Structures are given as structure tokens and as C-alpha cells.
Amino acid sequence: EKVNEILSQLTLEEKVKLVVGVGLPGLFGNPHSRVAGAAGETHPVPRVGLPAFVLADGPAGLRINPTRENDENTYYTTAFPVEIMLASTWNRELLEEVGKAMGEEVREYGVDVLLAPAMNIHRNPLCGRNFEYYSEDPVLSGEMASSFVKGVQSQGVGACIKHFVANNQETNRMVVDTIVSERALREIYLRGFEIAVKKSKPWSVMSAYNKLNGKYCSQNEWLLKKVLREEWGFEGFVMSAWYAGDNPVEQLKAGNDLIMPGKAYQVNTERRDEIEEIMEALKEGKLSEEVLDECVRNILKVLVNAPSFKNYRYSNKPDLEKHAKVAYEAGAEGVVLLRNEEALPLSENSKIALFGTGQIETIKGGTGSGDTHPRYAISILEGIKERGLNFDEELAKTYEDYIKKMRETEEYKPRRIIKPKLPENFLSEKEIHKLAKKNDVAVIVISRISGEGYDRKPVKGDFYLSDDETDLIKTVSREFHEQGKKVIVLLNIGSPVEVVSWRDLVDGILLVWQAGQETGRIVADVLTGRINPSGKLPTTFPRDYSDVPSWTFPGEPKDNPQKVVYEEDIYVGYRYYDTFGVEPAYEFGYGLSYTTFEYSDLNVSFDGETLRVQYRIENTGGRAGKEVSQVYIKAPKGKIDKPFQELKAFHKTRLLNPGESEEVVLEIPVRDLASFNGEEWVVEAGEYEVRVGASSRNIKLKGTFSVGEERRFKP
Ligand SMILES: OC[C@H]1O[C@H](O)[C@H](O)[C@@H](O)[C@@H]1O
Ligand SMILES: [Br-]
Ligand SMILES: [Br-]
Ligand SMILES: [Br-]
Ligand SMILES: [Br-]
Helix, strand or coil: CHHHHHHHHCCHHHHHHHCECCCCCCCCCCCCCCCCCCCEECCCEHHHCECCCEEECCCCCCCCCCCCCCCCCCCCCCCCCCHHHHHHCCCHHHHHHHHHHHHHHHHHCCCCEECCCECCCCCCCCCCCHHHCCCCCHHHHHHHHHHHHHHHHCCCCECEEEEECCCCCCCCCCCCEEECCHHHHHHHHHHHHHHHHHHHCCCEEEECCCEECCEEHHHCHHHHHHHHHHHCCCCCEEEECCCCCCCHHHHHHHCCCEECCCCHHHCCCCCCCHHHHHHHHHHHCCCCHHHHHHHHHHHHHHHCCCHHHHCCCCCCCCCHHHHHHHHHHHHHCCCEEEEECCCCCCCCCCCEEEECHHHCCCCCCCECCCCCCCCCCCCHHHHHHHCCCCECHHHHHHHHHHHHHHHHCCCCCCECCECCCCCCCCCCHHHHHHHHHHCCEEEEEEECCCECCCCCCCCECCCECCHHHHHHHHHHHHHHHHCCCEEEEEEECCCCCCCCCCHHHCCEEEECCCCHHHHHHHHHHHHHCCCCCCCCCCCCEECCHHHCCCCCCCCECCCCCCEEECCCCCCCCHHHHHHCCCCEEECCCCCECCCCEEEEEEEEEECCCEEEEEEEEEECCCCCECCEEEEEEECCCCCCCCCCCEEEEEEECCCECCCCEEEEEEEEEHHHHCEECCCCEEECCEEEEEEEEEECCEEEEEEEEEECCCEEECC
């Protein structure tokens, strides 16, 4: 009743103020948000008891200013592992915990809505923001997102799933027209958002920068209204990506309730003030008051539940120590062991020769709106020191000295905030020979960073190893292998890189991604086996970039794309590699363990409305560990073309001791089995195959069931 009451009290002008942000806080002419560093604020209306609501990034943790002027207090937040690493956990419960921790910091720092999680599909590994997205698969993505949203919103604050939809490249994102069939949309790109919307009920959705089939997402009625609302039954409000679109009136008409951050003229001289443009449109009858009321109601019906609406006295003192444990745990389960030829874990007291500048310049996460400002960030070297591991102390000082020297130099000093990539081959061929005799093992850090606004390139030093990185690995490998010793590589990266050319040169490979503030601790602990790797890939690692099915990336013309066509359609990520027989370097769902697991006791039953899959996993190794199991369904060929198989469920065991087992029981609604034929979802009659895998290509148990009667669903 409150909402309809406030609504009835508002004047036309106050209503317009409410659907437009107050401008980017603390930049240009604008005052700081009462939470300094926050991404945006709504217009207050004291008249009718509406406060300003505060919105802030981001996916890796709350992003606000750590300090404030005329203030002795401190406002640090927890920097969690990046989303691609969180997805690697394949652990819903854990993602929910990460949401709660973040949510407590959101609430207690006076924020009302967290601008997370990001959940665009990994269409192409070069997308600059892949690090802060979950997966190339909509079920993994949707399920991780749902868990995170539930976590955040258990804390009395709102989540915001973004970016809706098909924002799968950074190049010309604010302008590019994304051409995608309705089938690709419904099966791949819309699909994760559908799951999140239906299962977790996020307070808000952020419409994407890009056009979708001719229309800006922020101004796309089919997207924000027919699909989101009418079909899916979304009950929240939609906000625009910052400065997205070109027409505030079209945005409101489309179902984009909240225009952020407001004052677009401050960034684009050709935009009018949106309040003035809207007021004029109302005056002229270009926009009806009824549409305006709907947008305002969508906003209030959600935000009357925000802490700010009840004048919540936030503490400015969240439990950072408790949240750090959660960040460490998330990182611990998200590391992916890609290769282990009797190399890991390291023996106790093993003397480590630590290589690569990334050991010191460790990447905690990518740049942009999804960045964070934690009190600390434990480098790989620091974590190893902290845990008291036996490392070459002379070498570590050499690296420290070399980085200082290089970063002080003109060519490599941080510019404007990028740090030029350092040469990694500064050690002499004889210096490394000395290292091989002195130490027991080699550990080489390979680091990459990416971020909002920039796409990566299929070139050396980016997707490919730079020549100096290749030379370092070759030399270290040769030297240490001659001495009978093992070499380990740590991939401190945010998205796939080439691995085929060098992986056979080394014995161990740990994909440690970018693990936030606790990175070095997580990494050290994985090396010694205190952590048993349980992460599995949420995205495909291709042998070569030319293998990638999304070849049109980043569009036409390449250097200034006005449009990009998803030629590969539904056949993206593993759906492509499986269906057309292209072998990846490492497949979707792949990941090793320090122990072994045996799958057994498969039972499959379909009562016509629910597919029930049960099996048993036993730890047959000598170290406790968790196992991620994946259930792929292979639908019959029947009427329409379909991928080879599709992930429909997944699970992760508790921490099993040697000899322990766990019974897995998963249920899949019949509707989930459907393919979209362009008009409707269809679950074709026929024999289906259940494929329970330790990865999409390591199937451990197979069974079948039959659909007797075709089922159809209109969107
Ligand atoms: O920082 C506010 C927003 O700015 C941009 O729209 C980013 O794409 C979005 O992810 C972020 O939440
Ligand atoms: Br997407
Ligand atoms: Br391998
Ligand atoms: Br990266
Ligand atoms: Br194209």
C-alpha cells in the first residue's frame, strides 16, 4: 500500500526526478555521494519521505573510496576472487556465502544496491571483461548468479544482474549493433539471466550498452518488457548502464525505469539534460504520465525495502576479518589444477626458485568498474614468505630489485592507469643453470590483466605468451629437467591464454586466476597441498585463437565496429567444440585433483515431469578433496539441429576423506530439456542420453531415458 500512496503524493516533476540519477557522484560538477566513490544516487524527495538511494559496484567486491576528506576513518572493503574464478568453484553454497559477505559490507557501508553480479556469456576469450563474468555456459552462469544474488539479498540490500543482454565485447560497446538469432538469445545469452531472474529474484537488472538487433538494450521494449516482464515475470526495476542509450524517453517507454548515472551532457555534449528532455516529452504528449508512473512504481516497489528507506544507521564497520576468510575459501576452491606430472603438491621444505615478475606484481583482479581497493593484496611471493616456505632468497631480492629499477625507468613506469609489460628474460642462461643446481623445484608465474573498455588481442604478450615468457619457460624447463627437477607454472590470468606450445615443457600447471586480496595465501596453500585443488574450467581453453567459433569478434569493420554478427549462434563455447569435433587445449569443466574419485551407482528416472539423476562418488585417493560432477544431456536429433550435448545440472561434493563417498541426487525439470525452434521451446519425444562427467569430455557414467510425448512451451 505504501507505494501506491507515495505514488499518489508525488508531483509530475518529482516523478521525473526519480527516474533519473543525480549525475556521476564526485566527478565533474557533482558532489560526492554520501558514500564517497559510490557509482550513483537517486534523487531524494523529502517532501514525501523518499531518501536518496545509493548504488555501487561491483562484482569483485564493494568499490568505494577507502578514505574521505576531513575524515580519520577508513572504508576498506574485501576484494574477492574475480567471477571467472568464482565460477571455477562450481559451488553454489560457496557463491551464496560470497554474496552474504559482500552484502554485509554493502549494508553496513550505507549502500542500497550492489551493481553485481555480472553474468554476460564468455562468447569469445578476448572480451576484456571475461574476468568478471562466470561462464560460456548459461546454466553454470545462471546458477552461480542465482546463488550470489540470494547471498547479497539475504542482507537486506539489492543485487543487480548485468549486463542485459549480449554485451560480449568491449570494443565500441556503447555503439555496436549485436546481431543474434532469437534462438541463440533464448538458449545462450538470455538464458543465464532467465535462470537468475526466476530463481533469485534480483532487485534490479542493468540494461547493456550495446544495441541488440537494431535497438539499444536500454531502449529495447522486446527485451526489457516482453521478455523480462511479460514472459519471465521479473518483479524488480531496470537501470541503464552508465550513460547508455541516446534517448531518455525511449528508455522509459522500453521498460528501463532508472536512467543512470544522470546528466549525460557532462560526458557527451550532444545529450540534453534528461530531466528537461523528459519534462518536455510529457508536456508535448511524447510520453504518457501512465508510463512514467509505471517506471516510478517499479523503482519504489523495490527500494521501499532498501535500508536507506528506513533510515538504517549503518556502522561503517563490517566484519572485514570474517569476510577475508570467505574470500580465501572462495579462492581456495576456484584454483584449477590443469597439469600435474608428479609435480604437486610440493614436498615439505622443498627449496623453491620463484620466477616471473608476476610473483611480486601479482594481479588480484581486472580493472574498471569491477575493481576494488582492499587494505592489502598478498602477492605470490609474500604469501610464500608468510607461510615460511623455503624459497631462493637471493632470487627474490633480485626480482624485487629488477622491478624497482624497471618501474623507475621511462619506458616501464606506470602511465595514464596502465603498467607497461616488463621483460621476463633478464636472467642469464648461466644464472638459471646456477638456480637449477641450488634449488629443488621451479615455480614460474605468468601474469595477465584486462579490464572494462578494452578487448584483448590475439597477439604475443596477450592471448599468446610473449617471446621472453616463452624463452624463460624453455630455459628454466631445460635447466631444471637436466638436474632431475620439476617445473611448475602458475597462471595468474583473467581469461584463457595459449597453453599448447609450452605445457609439455613443464610438469605442473596451476590456474590461480586472479584471486583478490588473499591470492598469495591461497596460492602458497595450494602449492603445499594444504588446499587440494577442486576448481574446474567454466570456459573452454582453445588450442589456438583461430579455433574460436566466434570469429566475427569484434565486428565490422574490425577497427571501428558498427555491427557484429553471431554467426556461430548457439554453437558457442563447448557446444561448438563437441558438435563439430574441434579439440580444445583444455575443455569446459576440466580440472584435476591431488586425489582420485570413482563414480558409480548411476540411476536415471524420468516420471514425465522431472528427470532424476543419482550416482555415487568415492574418494579413492590418499588426500581429502572435493569433486565437481557435471550432468550433460544429449538430446536426440529428432526435428531440429542441436548441440552434441548440453550441461543441465552440476554438483560439488563435500570435502571427502580418503575412502569416503557421497550420494549425489540431482533433479531437472522437463522444461529444461527443450530447444527453441524460433517460435517456441520444444522438448522432443525420443531417447535422451545422460552423461555424468568429471568434465565435458571425461564422461564417467552414461544412461538413457525416454520422453514419450512431445512438450511445447510458448515463451
Ligand atoms: O560503474 C557503474 C557502471 O558503469 C558501467 O555501466 C559498467 O559497464 C557497469 O558494469 C558499472 O556497474
Ligand atoms: Br550475454
Ligand atoms: Br596437460
Ligand atoms: Br586477462
Ligand atoms: Br560481423
